[PDB]
Amino acid sequence: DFSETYERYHTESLQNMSKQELIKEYLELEKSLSRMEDENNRLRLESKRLDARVRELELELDRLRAENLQLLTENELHRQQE
Amino acid sequence: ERYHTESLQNMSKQELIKEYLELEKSLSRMEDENNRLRLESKRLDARVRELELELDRLRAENLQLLTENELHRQQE
């Protein structure tokens, strides 16, 4: 809400909980984290697979671009000579 | 359940609160990092499509260039 004013309120709020409610609330917060982690791992693997594909595709585009370039200047020279 | 009876409760309440805060704080860095991971890997997906087309298009040009190189080859 306000960045520090909120932490103040929010920490009082945990202060006015019992230890056992805090342990309850917290055990849920872990649930949520190991769920997020898992998705992190899924997301990192999919990003790594896609940048490999971009990698491969980029090379072939280079491999081919340079082929075309050469050809193109061969076709100019061998054309004008006519 | 109770692997935690012991973990969280050797701790003082004040330690727990500390522990709960920092855990909130990293759930939150991680939602940001996961967001970035979702967006990035959808951009990279756009990318691949853009590259699959530039490739196709480059192949059409390669075929033309080659067929022309071949015409000239035959006129020699």
From Swiss-Prot, chain B:
It is found in: Nucleus; Cytoplasm. Residues 39-76 are annotated as: Required for inhibition of ESR1-dependent transcription. The chain holds residues 272 to 350 of 359 of the full protein. It comes from the Eukaryota. Transcriptional regulator which functions as a general RNA polymerase II transcription inhibitor. Core component of the 7SK RNP complex: in cooperation with 7SK snRNA sequesters P-TEFb in a large inactive 7SK snRNP complex preventing RNA polymerase II phosphorylation and subsequent transcriptional elongation. May also regulate NF-kappa-B, ESR1, NR3C1 and CIITA-dependent transcriptional activity. Residues 15-43 are annotated as: Mediates interaction with CCNT1. Induction: Up-regulated by HMBA (hexamethylene bisacetamide) (at protein level). Down-regulated by estrogen. Changing residue 65 to A: Loss of oligomerization. Residues 12-75 form a coiled coil. The coiled-coil domain mediates oligomerization. Inhibits Tat activity which is required for HIV-1 transcription. This is Protein HEXIM1. Belongs to the HEXIM family. Homooligomer and heterooligomer with HEXIM2; probably dimeric. Core component of the 7SK RNP complex, at least composed of 7SK RNA, LARP7, MEPCE, HEXIM1 (or HEXIM2) and P-TEFb (composed of CDK9 and CCNT1/cyclin-T1). Interacts with the N-CoR complex through NCOR1. Interacts with ESR1 and NR3C1. May interact with NF-kappa-B through RELA. Interacts with CCNT2; mediates formation of a tripartite complex with KPNA2. Part of the HDP-RNP complex composed of at least HEXIM1, PRKDC, XRCC5, XRCC6, paraspeckle proteins (SFPQ, NONO, PSPC1, RBM14, and MATR3) and NEAT1 non-coding RNA. The gene is HEXIM1. Ubiquitously expressed with higher expression in placenta. HEXIM1 and HEXIM2 are differentially expressed. Expressed in endocrine tissues. The lineage of its organism: Eukaryota, Metazoa, Chordata, Craniata, Vertebrata.
